[PDB]
mmCIF file of all heavy atoms in Angstrom:
data_model
loop_
_atom_site.group_PDB
_atom_site.id
_atom_site.type_symbol
_atom_site.label_atom_id
_atom_site.label_comp_id
_atom_site.label_asym_id
_atom_site.label_seq_id
_atom_site.Cartn_x
_atom_site.Cartn_y
_atom_site.Cartn_z
ATOM 1 N N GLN R 1 -1.297 8.791 10.489
ATOM 2 C CA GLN R 1 -1.696 10.136 10.278
ATOM 3 C C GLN R 1 -0.913 10.786 9.070
ATOM 4 O O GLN R 1 -1.341 11.693 8.496
ATOM 5 C CB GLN R 1 -1.694 10.948 11.576
ATOM 6 C CG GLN R 1 -2.844 10.611 12.520
ATOM 7 C CD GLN R 1 -2.702 11.130 13.887
ATOM 8 O OE1 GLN R 1 -1.811 12.065 14.166
ATOM 9 N NE2 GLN R 1 -3.503 10.822 14.756
ATOM 10 N N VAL R 2 0.350 10.408 8.857
ATOM 11 C CA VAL R 2 1.278 10.975 7.895
ATOM 12 C C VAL R 2 1.607 9.905 6.718
ATOM 13 O O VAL R 2 1.882 10.359 5.591
ATOM 14 C CB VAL R 2 2.548 11.485 8.459
ATOM 15 C CG1 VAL R 2 2.297 12.727 9.265
ATOM 16 C CG2 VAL R 2 3.324 10.420 9.269
ATOM 17 N N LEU R 3 1.414 8.601 6.952
ATOM 18 C CA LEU R 3 1.565 7.651 5.900
ATOM 19 C C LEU R 3 0.232 7.509 5.017
ATOM 20 O O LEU R 3 0.343 7.395 3.821
ATOM 21 C CB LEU R 3 1.900 6.267 6.553
ATOM 22 C CG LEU R 3 3.358 6.202 7.092
ATOM 23 C CD1 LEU R 3 3.474 5.026 7.995
ATOM 24 C CD2 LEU R 3 4.315 6.077 5.896
ATOM 25 N N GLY R 4 -0.861 7.600 5.666
ATOM 26 C CA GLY R 4 -2.168 7.520 5.062
ATOM 27 C C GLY R 4 -2.374 8.448 3.918
ATOM 28 O O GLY R 4 -2.646 8.076 2.714
ATOM 29 N N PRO R 5 -2.408 9.855 4.236
ATOM 30 C CA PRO R 5 -2.634 10.778 3.212
ATOM 31 C C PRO R 5 -1.661 10.921 2.044
ATOM 32 O O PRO R 5 -1.854 11.564 1.033
ATOM 33 C CB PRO R 5 -2.694 12.145 3.919
ATOM 34 C CG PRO R 5 -2.991 11.781 5.477
ATOM 35 C CD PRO R 5 -2.196 10.437 5.506
ATOM 36 N N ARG R 6 -0.401 10.334 2.267
ATOM 37 C CA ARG R 6 0.683 10.355 1.368
ATOM 38 C C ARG R 6 0.705 9.074 0.351
ATOM 39 O O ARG R 6 1.461 8.963 -0.519
ATOM 40 C CB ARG R 6 2.006 10.453 2.003
ATOM 41 C CG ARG R 6 2.302 11.970 2.431
ATOM 42 C CD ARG R 6 3.650 11.963 3.111
ATOM 43 N NE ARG R 6 4.117 13.300 3.136
ATOM 44 C CZ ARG R 6 4.233 14.239 4.191
ATOM 45 N NH1 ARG R 6 3.644 13.949 5.330
ATOM 46 N NH2 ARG R 6 4.747 15.321 3.971
ATOM 47 N N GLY R 7 -0.229 8.206 0.630
ATOM 48 C CA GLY R 7 -0.328 6.852 -0.206
ATOM 49 C C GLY R 7 0.830 5.856 0.092
ATOM 50 O O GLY R 7 1.266 5.217 -0.891
ATOM 51 N N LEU R 8 1.232 5.855 1.309
ATOM 52 C CA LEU R 8 2.358 5.025 1.815
ATOM 53 C C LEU R 8 1.950 4.016 2.840
ATOM 54 O O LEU R 8 2.868 3.199 3.318
ATOM 55 C CB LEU R 8 3.553 5.984 2.247
ATOM 56 C CG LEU R 8 4.055 6.889 1.271
ATOM 57 C CD1 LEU R 8 5.165 7.906 1.904
ATOM 58 C CD2 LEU R 8 4.739 6.229 -0.003
ATOM 59 N N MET R 9 0.736 4.027 3.366
ATOM 60 C CA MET R 9 0.369 3.231 4.550
ATOM 61 C C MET R 9 0.216 1.659 4.188
ATOM 62 O O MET R 9 -0.527 1.409 3.360
ATOM 63 C CB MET R 9 -0.957 3.847 5.016
ATOM 64 C CG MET R 9 -1.354 3.174 6.392
ATOM 65 S SD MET R 9 -0.288 3.460 7.852
ATOM 66 C CE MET R 9 -1.260 2.771 9.025
ATOM 67 N N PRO R 10 0.934 0.832 4.920
ATOM 68 C CA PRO R 10 0.685 -0.616 4.849
ATOM 69 C C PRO R 10 -0.696 -0.932 5.645
ATOM 70 O O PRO R 10 -0.997 -0.446 6.788
ATOM 71 C CB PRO R 10 1.895 -1.274 5.530
ATOM 72 C CG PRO R 10 2.375 -0.204 6.479
ATOM 73 C CD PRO R 10 1.993 1.118 5.900
ATOM 74 N N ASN R 11 -1.511 -1.783 5.022
ATOM 75 C CA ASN R 11 -2.805 -2.114 5.494
ATOM 76 C C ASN R 11 -3.031 -3.615 5.439
ATOM 77 O O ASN R 11 -2.903 -4.209 4.330
ATOM 78 C CB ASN R 11 -3.856 -1.304 4.677
ATOM 79 C CG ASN R 11 -5.222 -1.593 4.916
ATOM 80 O OD1 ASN R 11 -5.733 -2.533 5.692
ATOM 81 N ND2 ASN R 11 -6.194 -1.101 4.079
ATOM 82 N N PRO R 12 -3.438 -4.380 6.617
ATOM 83 C CA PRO R 12 -3.644 -5.754 6.619
ATOM 84 C C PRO R 12 -4.722 -6.316 5.516
ATOM 85 O O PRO R 12 -4.762 -7.348 5.184
ATOM 86 C CB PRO R 12 -4.128 -6.070 7.952
ATOM 87 C CG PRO R 12 -3.600 -4.978 8.853
ATOM 88 C CD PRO R 12 -3.525 -3.884 7.946
ATOM 89 N N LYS R 13 -5.717 -5.399 5.236
ATOM 90 C CA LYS R 13 -6.825 -5.760 4.273
ATOM 91 C C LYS R 13 -6.381 -5.807 2.762
ATOM 92 O O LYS R 13 -7.177 -6.284 1.965
ATOM 93 C CB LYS R 13 -8.038 -4.717 4.484
ATOM 94 C CG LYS R 13 -9.277 -5.115 3.881
ATOM 95 C CD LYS R 13 -10.511 -4.417 4.541
ATOM 96 C CE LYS R 13 -11.711 -4.766 3.680
ATOM 97 N NZ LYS R 13 -12.889 -4.151 4.367
ATOM 98 N N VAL R 14 -5.248 -5.325 2.466
ATOM 99 C CA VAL R 14 -4.617 -5.466 1.167
ATOM 100 C C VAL R 14 -3.251 -6.205 1.148
ATOM 101 O O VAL R 14 -2.547 -6.041 0.184
ATOM 102 C CB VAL R 14 -4.534 -4.114 0.392
ATOM 103 C CG1 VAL R 14 -5.849 -3.353 0.328
ATOM 104 C CG2 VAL R 14 -3.536 -3.167 1.172
ATOM 105 N N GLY R 15 -3.003 -6.949 2.176
ATOM 106 C CA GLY R 15 -1.812 -7.847 2.327
ATOM 107 C C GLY R 15 -0.501 -7.189 2.373
ATOM 108 O O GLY R 15 0.583 -7.765 2.201
ATOM 109 N N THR R 16 -0.410 -5.765 2.672
ATOM 110 C CA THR R 16 0.894 -5.034 2.859
ATOM 111 C C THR R 16 1.372 -5.132 4.324
ATOM 112 O O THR R 16 2.490 -4.698 4.600
ATOM 113 C CB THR R 16 0.754 -3.626 2.288
ATOM 114 O OG1 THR R 16 -0.344 -2.949 2.648
ATOM 115 C CG2 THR R 16 0.792 -3.689 0.727
ATOM 116 N N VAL R 17 0.663 -5.608 5.264
ATOM 117 C CA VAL R 17 0.991 -6.127 6.588
ATOM 118 C C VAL R 17 0.820 -7.534 6.680
ATOM 119 O O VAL R 17 -0.313 -8.150 6.747
ATOM 120 C CB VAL R 17 0.169 -5.364 7.708
ATOM 121 C CG1 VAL R 17 0.684 -5.850 9.148
ATOM 122 C CG2 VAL R 17 0.256 -3.900 7.587
ATOM 123 N N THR R 18 1.858 -8.437 6.506
ATOM 124 C CA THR R 18 1.833 -9.866 6.351
ATOM 125 C C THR R 18 3.137 -10.468 6.764
ATOM 126 O O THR R 18 4.128 -9.932 6.578
ATOM 127 C CB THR R 18 1.501 -10.202 4.912
ATOM 128 O OG1 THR R 18 1.369 -11.607 4.893
ATOM 129 C CG2 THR R 18 2.645 -9.787 3.924
ATOM 130 N N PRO R 19 3.103 -11.664 7.474
ATOM 131 C CA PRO R 19 4.320 -12.376 7.804
ATOM 132 C C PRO R 19 5.271 -12.884 6.806
ATOM 133 O O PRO R 19 6.301 -13.010 6.944
ATOM 134 C CB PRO R 19 3.851 -13.607 8.779
ATOM 135 C CG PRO R 19 2.465 -13.318 9.007
ATOM 136 C CD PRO R 19 1.915 -12.431 7.937
ATOM 137 N N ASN R 20 4.755 -13.008 5.490
ATOM 138 C CA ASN R 20 5.436 -13.484 4.439
ATOM 139 C C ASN R 20 6.086 -12.323 3.494
ATOM 140 O O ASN R 20 5.880 -12.254 2.260
ATOM 141 C CB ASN R 20 4.645 -14.523 3.563
ATOM 142 C CG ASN R 20 3.534 -13.965 2.648
ATOM 143 O OD1 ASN R 20 2.907 -12.852 2.942
ATOM 144 N ND2 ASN R 20 3.225 -14.509 1.530
ATOM 145 N N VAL R 21 6.745 -11.473 4.232
ATOM 146 C CA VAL R 21 7.351 -10.279 3.601
ATOM 147 C C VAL R 21 8.229 -10.503 2.326
ATOM 148 O O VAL R 21 8.265 -9.714 1.438
ATOM 149 C CB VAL R 21 8.076 -9.302 4.572
ATOM 150 C CG1 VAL R 21 7.128 -8.851 5.655
ATOM 151 C CG2 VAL R 21 9.275 -9.958 5.184
ATOM 152 N N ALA R 22 8.969 -11.701 2.346
ATOM 153 C CA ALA R 22 9.794 -12.233 1.234
ATOM 154 C C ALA R 22 8.947 -12.544 -0.051
ATOM 155 O O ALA R 22 9.606 -12.975 -1.047
ATOM 156 C CB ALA R 22 10.722 -13.198 1.681
ATOM 157 N N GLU R 23 7.653 -12.517 -0.016
ATOM 158 C CA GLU R 23 6.723 -12.702 -1.197
ATOM 159 C C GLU R 23 6.047 -11.243 -1.492
ATOM 160 O O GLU R 23 5.806 -10.928 -2.635
ATOM 161 C CB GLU R 23 5.659 -13.739 -1.039
ATOM 162 C CG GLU R 23 6.373 -15.184 -1.028
ATOM 163 C CD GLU R 23 5.457 -16.256 -1.083
ATOM 164 O OE1 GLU R 23 4.619 -16.559 -0.048
ATOM 165 O OE2 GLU R 23 5.399 -16.931 -2.045
ATOM 166 N N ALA R 24 5.773 -10.560 -0.388
ATOM 167 C CA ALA R 24 5.139 -9.201 -0.460
ATOM 168 C C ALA R 24 6.003 -8.166 -1.111
ATOM 169 O O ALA R 24 5.495 -7.220 -1.856
ATOM 170 C CB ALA R 24 4.598 -8.797 0.959
ATOM 171 N N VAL R 25 7.305 -8.234 -0.878
ATOM 172 C CA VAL R 25 8.284 -7.250 -1.621
ATOM 173 C C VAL R 25 8.410 -7.597 -2.935
ATOM 174 O O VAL R 25 8.568 -6.740 -3.828
ATOM 175 C CB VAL R 25 9.616 -7.063 -0.879
ATOM 176 C CG1 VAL R 25 9.422 -6.572 0.556
ATOM 177 C CG2 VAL R 25 10.450 -8.389 -0.856
ATOM 178 N N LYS R 26 8.309 -8.878 -3.381
ATOM 179 C CA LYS R 26 8.375 -9.470 -4.785
ATOM 180 C C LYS R 26 7.027 -8.834 -5.516
ATOM 181 O O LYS R 26 7.140 -8.444 -6.642
ATOM 182 C CB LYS R 26 8.493 -10.827 -4.983
ATOM 183 C CG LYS R 26 9.793 -11.374 -4.380
ATOM 184 C CD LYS R 26 9.918 -12.878 -4.634
ATOM 185 C CE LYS R 26 11.286 -13.433 -4.123
ATOM 186 N NZ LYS R 26 11.529 -14.743 -4.517
ATOM 187 N N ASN R 27 5.945 -8.795 -4.845
ATOM 188 C CA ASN R 27 4.651 -8.178 -5.425
ATOM 189 C C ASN R 27 4.780 -6.548 -5.360
ATOM 190 O O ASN R 27 4.212 -5.841 -6.104
ATOM 191 C CB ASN R 27 3.480 -8.724 -4.610
ATOM 192 C CG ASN R 27 2.201 -8.161 -5.111
ATOM 193 O OD1 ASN R 27 1.696 -8.507 -6.196
ATOM 194 N ND2 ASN R 27 1.645 -7.152 -4.460
ATOM 195 N N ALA R 28 5.662 -5.989 -4.510
ATOM 196 C CA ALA R 28 5.936 -4.520 -4.397
ATOM 197 C C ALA R 28 6.845 -4.010 -5.698
ATOM 198 O O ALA R 28 6.968 -2.917 -6.013
ATOM 199 C CB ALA R 28 6.568 -4.110 -3.264
ATOM 200 N N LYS R 29 7.479 -5.085 -6.446
ATOM 201 C CA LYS R 29 8.173 -4.856 -7.794
ATOM 202 C C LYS R 29 7.251 -5.216 -8.999
ATOM 203 O O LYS R 29 7.776 -5.261 -10.031
ATOM 204 C CB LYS R 29 9.503 -5.594 -7.670
ATOM 205 C CG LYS R 29 10.416 -5.136 -6.501
ATOM 206 C CD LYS R 29 10.957 -3.693 -6.881
ATOM 207 C CE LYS R 29 11.853 -3.259 -5.777
ATOM 208 N NZ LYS R 29 12.496 -1.985 -5.996
ATOM 209 N N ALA R 30 6.029 -5.575 -8.782
ATOM 210 C CA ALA R 30 5.090 -6.100 -9.838
ATOM 211 C C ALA R 30 4.336 -5.055 -10.594
ATOM 212 O O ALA R 30 3.495 -5.210 -11.392
ATOM 213 C CB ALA R 30 4.051 -7.060 -9.146
ATOM 214 N N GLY R 31 4.780 -3.718 -10.450
ATOM 215 C CA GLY R 31 4.254 -2.528 -11.129
ATOM 216 C C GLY R 31 2.993 -1.996 -10.465
ATOM 217 O O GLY R 31 1.862 -1.875 -11.122
ATOM 218 N N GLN R 32 3.120 -1.665 -9.126
ATOM 219 C CA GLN R 32 1.987 -1.202 -8.365
ATOM 220 C C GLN R 32 1.641 0.182 -8.585
ATOM 221 O O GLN R 32 2.526 1.241 -8.592
ATOM 222 C CB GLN R 32 2.220 -1.419 -6.776
ATOM 223 C CG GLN R 32 2.254 -2.889 -6.408
ATOM 224 C CD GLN R 32 2.307 -3.081 -4.916
ATOM 225 O OE1 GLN R 32 2.022 -2.115 -4.122
ATOM 226 N NE2 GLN R 32 2.582 -4.281 -4.438
ATOM 227 N N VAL R 33 0.282 0.489 -8.894
ATOM 228 C CA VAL R 33 -0.211 1.793 -9.116
ATOM 229 C C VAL R 33 -1.445 2.016 -8.063
ATOM 230 O O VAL R 33 -2.417 1.204 -8.104
ATOM 231 C CB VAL R 33 -0.759 1.904 -10.533
ATOM 232 C CG1 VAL R 33 -1.129 3.370 -10.834
ATOM 233 C CG2 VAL R 33 0.325 1.499 -11.489
ATOM 234 N N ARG R 34 -1.387 2.939 -7.153
ATOM 235 C CA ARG R 34 -2.451 3.399 -6.386
ATOM 236 C C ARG R 34 -3.326 4.524 -7.009
ATOM 237 O O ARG R 34 -2.841 5.341 -7.884
ATOM 238 C CB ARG R 34 -1.958 3.843 -4.959
ATOM 239 C CG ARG R 34 -0.966 5.027 -5.153
ATOM 240 C CD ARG R 34 -0.619 5.482 -3.700
ATOM 241 N NE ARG R 34 0.598 6.357 -3.718
ATOM 242 C CZ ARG R 34 0.749 7.513 -4.033
ATOM 243 N NH1 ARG R 34 -0.133 8.378 -4.503
ATOM 244 N NH2 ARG R 34 2.096 8.022 -4.124
ATOM 245 N N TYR R 35 -4.740 4.389 -6.807
ATOM 246 C CA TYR R 35 -5.700 5.381 -7.279
ATOM 247 C C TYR R 35 -6.604 5.949 -6.256
ATOM 248 O O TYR R 35 -6.962 5.110 -5.185
ATOM 249 C CB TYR R 35 -6.460 4.724 -8.333
ATOM 250 C CG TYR R 35 -7.266 3.450 -8.074
ATOM 251 C CD1 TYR R 35 -8.575 3.485 -7.536
ATOM 252 C CD2 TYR R 35 -6.612 2.150 -8.167
ATOM 253 C CE1 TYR R 35 -9.236 2.318 -7.202
ATOM 254 C CE2 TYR R 35 -7.357 1.013 -7.978
ATOM 255 C CZ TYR R 35 -8.674 1.114 -7.409
ATOM 256 O OH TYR R 35 -9.444 -0.014 -7.123
ATOM 257 N N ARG R 36 -7.000 7.151 -6.274
ATOM 258 C CA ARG R 36 -7.908 7.822 -5.339
ATOM 259 C C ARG R 36 -8.697 8.957 -6.048
ATOM 260 O O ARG R 36 -7.916 9.959 -6.533
ATOM 261 C CB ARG R 36 -7.211 8.390 -4.100
ATOM 262 C CG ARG R 36 -8.149 8.635 -2.924
ATOM 263 C CD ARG R 36 -7.523 9.673 -1.992
ATOM 264 N NE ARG R 36 -7.773 11.047 -2.350
ATOM 265 C CZ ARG R 36 -6.838 12.025 -2.592
ATOM 266 N NH1 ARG R 36 -5.623 11.942 -2.619
ATOM 267 N NH2 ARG R 36 -7.241 13.226 -2.937
ATOM 268 N N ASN R 37 -10.078 9.011 -5.995
ATOM 269 C CA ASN R 37 -10.739 10.143 -6.563
ATOM 270 C C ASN R 37 -10.729 11.290 -5.690
ATOM 271 O O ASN R 37 -10.776 11.184 -4.446
ATOM 272 C CB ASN R 37 -12.150 9.709 -7.169
ATOM 273 C CG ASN R 37 -13.187 9.659 -6.055
ATOM 274 O OD1 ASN R 37 -13.447 8.576 -5.487
ATOM 275 N ND2 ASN R 37 -13.865 10.682 -5.674
ATOM 276 N N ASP R 38 -10.936 12.517 -6.144
ATOM 277 C CA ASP R 38 -11.280 13.696 -5.358
ATOM 278 C C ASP R 38 -12.592 14.398 -5.780
ATOM 279 O O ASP R 38 -13.427 13.762 -6.508
ATOM 280 C CB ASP R 38 -10.054 14.703 -5.498
ATOM 281 C CG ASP R 38 -9.984 15.668 -4.363
ATOM 282 O OD1 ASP R 38 -9.564 15.262 -3.261
ATOM 283 O OD2 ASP R 38 -10.403 16.822 -4.493
ATOM 284 N N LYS R 39 -12.877 15.594 -5.459
ATOM 285 C CA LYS R 39 -14.087 16.320 -5.700
ATOM 286 C C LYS R 39 -14.389 16.324 -7.238
ATOM 287 O O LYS R 39 -13.546 16.321 -8.058
ATOM 288 C CB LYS R 39 -14.064 17.781 -5.197
ATOM 289 C CG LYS R 39 -14.071 17.672 -3.664
ATOM 290 C CD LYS R 39 -14.188 19.215 -3.087
ATOM 291 C CE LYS R 39 -14.306 19.323 -1.647
ATOM 292 N NZ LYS R 39 -14.799 20.601 -1.110
#
């Protein structure tokens, strides 16, 4: 409810909830940019 609207939520469908965290944090340093349209 507070991570989702802030663009901070980990989601299993985009690999940010995963047992291999020592490869997922290396991808968190790969230049990540989130996008969302409004009205």
Side-chain angles (χ1 to χ4, degrees):
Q1 285 172 14
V2 293
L3 288 167
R6 284 181 160 106
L8 299 175
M9 188 64 174
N11 174 1
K13 191 163 173 173
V14 304
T16 51
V17 184
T18 184
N20 77 331
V21 299
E23 297 188 285
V25 301
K26 295 185 178 188
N27 184 76
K29 300 289 179 174
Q32 290 191 12
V33 190
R34 56 174 166 79
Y35 62 87
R36 196 200 89 239
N37 85 266
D38 203 78
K39 289 185 179 198

